[PDB]
Structures are given as C-alpha cells and as structure tokens.
Design a protein around this ligand. Sequence first.
Ligand SMILES: *[C@@H]1O[C@H](CO)[C@@H](O[C@@H]2O[C@H](CO)[C@@H](O)[C@H](O)[C@H]2NC(C)=O)[C@H](O)[C@H]1NC(C)=O
Ligand SMILES: OC[C@@H]1O[C@@H](O[C@H]2[C@H](O[C@@H]3CO[C@@H](O)[C@H](O)[C@H]3O)OC[C@@H](O)[C@@H]2O)[C@H](O)[C@H]1O
Ligand SMILES: OC[C@@H]1O[C@@H](O[C@H]2[C@H](O[C@@H]3CO[C@@H](O)[C@H](O)[C@H]3O)OC[C@@H](O)[C@@H]2O)[C@H](O)[C@H]1O
Length: 482
Amino acid sequence: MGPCDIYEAGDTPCVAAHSTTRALYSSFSGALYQLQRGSDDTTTTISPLTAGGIADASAQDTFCANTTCLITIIYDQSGNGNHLTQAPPGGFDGPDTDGYDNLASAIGAPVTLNGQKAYGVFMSPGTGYRNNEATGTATGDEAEGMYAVLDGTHYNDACCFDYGNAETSSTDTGAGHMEAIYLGNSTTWGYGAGDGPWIMVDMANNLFSGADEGYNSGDPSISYRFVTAAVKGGADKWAIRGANAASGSLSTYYSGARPDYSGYNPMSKEGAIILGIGGDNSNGAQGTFYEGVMTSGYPSDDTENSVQENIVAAKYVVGSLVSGPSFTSGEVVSLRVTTPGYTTRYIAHTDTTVNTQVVDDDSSTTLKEEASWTVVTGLANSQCFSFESVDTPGSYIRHYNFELLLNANDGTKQFHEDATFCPQAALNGEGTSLRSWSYPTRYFRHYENVLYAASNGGVQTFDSKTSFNNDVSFEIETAFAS
Ligand SMILES: *[C@@H]1O[C@H](CO)[C@@H](O[C@@H]2O[C@H](CO)[C@@H](O)[C@H](O)[C@H]2NC(C)=O)[C@H](O)[C@H]1NC(C)=O
Ligand SMILES: OC[C@@H]1O[C@@H](O[C@H]2[C@H](O[C@@H]3CO[C@@H](O)[C@H](O)[C@H]3O)OC[C@@H](O)[C@@H]2O)[C@H](O)[C@H]1O
Ligand SMILES: OC[C@@H]1O[C@@H](O[C@H]2[C@H](O[C@@H]3CO[C@@H](O)[C@H](O)[C@H]3O)OC[C@@H](O)[C@@H]2O)[C@H](O)[C@H]1O
C-alpha cells in the first residue's frame, strides 16, 4: 500500500496527491510531472518505473542532457486533476514574466528512495506552484488532513514556504481563509522553541505554532534532512505532527482548539492548493518538496502513523549534487572560458566585480592571483564548493542580485548560500558548469565579460539563451598563482 491507499483505508481519502519522486498509490503508473528543456523548449513527462514505483529518473537525465530543465507541472495522482503549475501573481508579484513565480529546476534536489535515484522540487526564493480551481479540497470549515516530505536543512525566514489550502483569488482575504503546512524560521507571526525551522500551520495573517499568536514553546525546531510534516484541521480543532521522514514516529507538537482569535473558528477555507508560497503569493521563501497530499476528512493519528511508517520504508537518502570533473578542498585552480572568441580569458576579478580577463604568463602577479581560486568545501553544502580569492583571502565568489561579486565571508547563512556552487559536467562538453546551490536554475555565466548567476533564459538580459551553454562551460586548469 501507498500513502493514499492508507488514507483511503482510514476513510479520509486523498483529494490531491503530488510527488516528483514516487507514486503515492500502489496502482498509479501515470505521469508524476512534466519537464521542459531550455534547448528547444519541448516537453516530456516522467512516470514511475513500475505501477506504484519510483520515478523514472534516467528518462529525465536523457531528456535534459547538455541543456537545462524546469519542472513545469506536478501532476495530481488522485484523479481529481489538481495538478500544480506555475504560480500566478496575487497580492504580491512573482519575479517572473508578468508577475508569475519561477518554475523550479529539475535537478536541485537529487535523492534515492531505496537505492533508486529520484528528483525532488528544490525551490529557491521566488519559486512557486499553484492550482486555483481544485476539486474535492475542503472549503469553509470542512475537515482535512495533509502532509509533505521536505528538506529540514533548506529554508529561510521569509514568507512563506507552504503546502496546503489557500485562497482561490491569490489574495489575502482574511484570517481563516487558509490552512497549510509551513516550514521555516520566520518569527513575524508564530514560532516555536530554538533557532528553527518550525512546522507551523498557515491560517492566513498568522503562522501558528500553537494556541497563542506568536511564541509557543511546544513547537520544537525540526531540522532533519528529511522531514515529515503532518497537519490537519477540523471543526474547532487542528494539530501539528512532525518526524524524521527517514526514521521513527510522528510526534504531536500541537493538538486542540483553534487559536482563540476572530476569524479562526469557524474557518473559511477556499480550496486552492499552493506550494512554496503564501496565500497572497508572498514568494520570498525557500524549501524542498519531495511528496505530499491533501485529504478530505480529519485523519486519525493511527492513520498518519501508518503513513509515516510507509514513508520511512521508502528510505529517502540524499543523492549526489555533483557530476563531471569536480574539485578537492584546498586545490587552487584557474577557470578558462570555452566560448569561441573568448577562449583566452579566465574568471578573475577587479575589486568586488567578478569578470573574465585575458590572463597569461606576461600578466602581473596581482592579476594572476585575481584569476586564481582556492576551492573549499561548500559553505552551505558539504557536497559542493565555494571559491575563495587567492589575492584576497577571506572573500569568496557570491551571487548578489544575480551578479557574481567577490565579498568577504561574513559568517551568515545568507552569505554561505549565496556562495555555494555545485560542479556539473559542462553543458558544452568542455570542463565544468558551476551550478548555484541555492538557485539550481542558475549557473556561472559570462555576459560581456562579466560573471552572473544566469539561467537559460529569463527576465534579466544576462540570461540570454544565445551562447548559453558555452558561456556556462569552463575548463579547470592549473592556477596562475602557481
Ligand atoms: C533565522 O535563522 C538565521 C540563521 O540562524 C538567522 O540569521 C542571522 O541573521 C542575523 C540577522 O540578519 C545576523 O546578525 C546573524 O549574523 C545571522 N546568523 C546566521 C548563523 O546566519 C535569522 O535572523 C533567523 N531569523 C529570524 C526571523 O529569527
Ligand atoms: O542573487 C540573488 C539574491 O540577491 C540578494 O538579495 C537581494 C534581493 O534579491 C531578490 C532575492 O530573491 C529573488 O527571488 C529576487 O528575484 C531578487 O530580486 O533584492 C533585495 C536586496 O536588498 C537583497 O539583498 C541576495 O544576497 C541573493 O541571494
Ligand atoms: O561574455 C562574453 C560574451 O558576451 C556576449 O556577447 C555578446 C557581445 O558582447 C560583447 C561582449 O564583450 C564586450 O567587450 C563588448 O563590448 C560586447 O559588445 O555583444 C554582441 C552579442 O551578440 C554577443 O552575444 C556573449 O553572450 C558572451 O559569450
């Protein structure tokens, strides 16, 4: 049996079921999600390898070879047609065309479920999916349940990384017009114990960690690499349950009456489904979604425990984020441009500006150093890397407003994430392509001899598809600084 089979057995059936990693029904073999490669913009779908099995990743790899990929649709396996597609603008605008949110990369969250490779939805700030005309989802004060397997080490404090019931207009229509899972360390509304992140329930104009608005000590910080967040709401009652999605039981962080504030009882749910964003399209949060569902009816604890066990059985394990040449901590290198007509340039810098310059044996020692980089263990992820300036030790290459700048490590998480890159086999076949860890849809890319964290097409001029593959491919060579 799969998650939804278990929920059906408990009389609180899935009315929405999403996952880019596995089928949530033992008998599902349809499409899990849709892809679109930047090369020609064509699409293809990825289905389980077998009925009720794991996603066919090799098919994605084949289709996305020598190019980039975005996850255009996350199909609803329940049959209700509640697929998730690019989230539209609302109270707030998205950073994409006409205010839509960004689609997520297809390779930002690699994992294996019991030895079988799969891909999750790595969402960076500005990313988001939605369905404002869903069927079967709870409305008004009707009971519902939900859960999602997320990455407890990928999150921030901006509003709002949710998954659940939201407004059909994409605007904040008031308290009680929402009921969704939230995971992050925002403290603007509710928050629990510790540094975070905390699993809270977004009920509109409030992320609740318990009965009271704001602080509630009963909600602990949960930072497992794989987290199961189980939330449910009914007639003047709701609950929060969390667990290590890779081992053990669900613990109950809250169970009881609605917050005693106007608008929260009875609730006024609207039935829309959001992912990675807030109800009014607040899109500054980040996170990773692997699988999740929404149900009709208040799931019993026994039902959720069975689900949790099934998830544990799925055996989630982190996959490799790196491919191609790759580096070793402490190694000193120089990165050469492979784009025809600039093949003698190297990634260097002029103050905080990271650019490409012609560097050779006649170059001064200062320029040789500006073009030499000490590779160190990724500041935000131990699998990837960070590039430290040879001439200016203590400073690293980081993306700011999508430009690559050479700034000093200020020890903050933000800096750490803006300075972590993952080696990927060069797209043009020559060398490596440094993929941004926090923004997997972006790579090191030179545009008019300046370095940006560019995507294959986008709202910034430096995201041009023209010569993209070449501009994101570099040959790893012996450092000039010897
Ligand atoms: C969420 O957690 C992060 C990481 O613990 C907090 O970030 C720090 O941010 C402050 C305010 O910008 C800086 O003084 C610190 O140097 C940062 N520390 C680290 C370790 O990054 C962030 O403030 C927390 N957010 C909330 C709302 O509590
Ligand atoms: O390199 C991208 C981010 O720029 C810096 O943040 C600045 C922020 O940027 C927004 C970040 O979120 C994206 O979704 C938006 O598309 C982008 O505009 O704009 C306001 C500035 O005051 C922030 O410093 C971050 O350092 C970096 O991660
Ligand atoms: O990053 C180097 C190349 O820039 C982009 O090229 C475009 C070219 O840009 C020139 C880049 O070099 C500066 O010194 C020049 O002042 C500037 O004109 O302009 C014409 C466009 O058609 C080129 O694509 C390429 O993307 C990149 O390889």
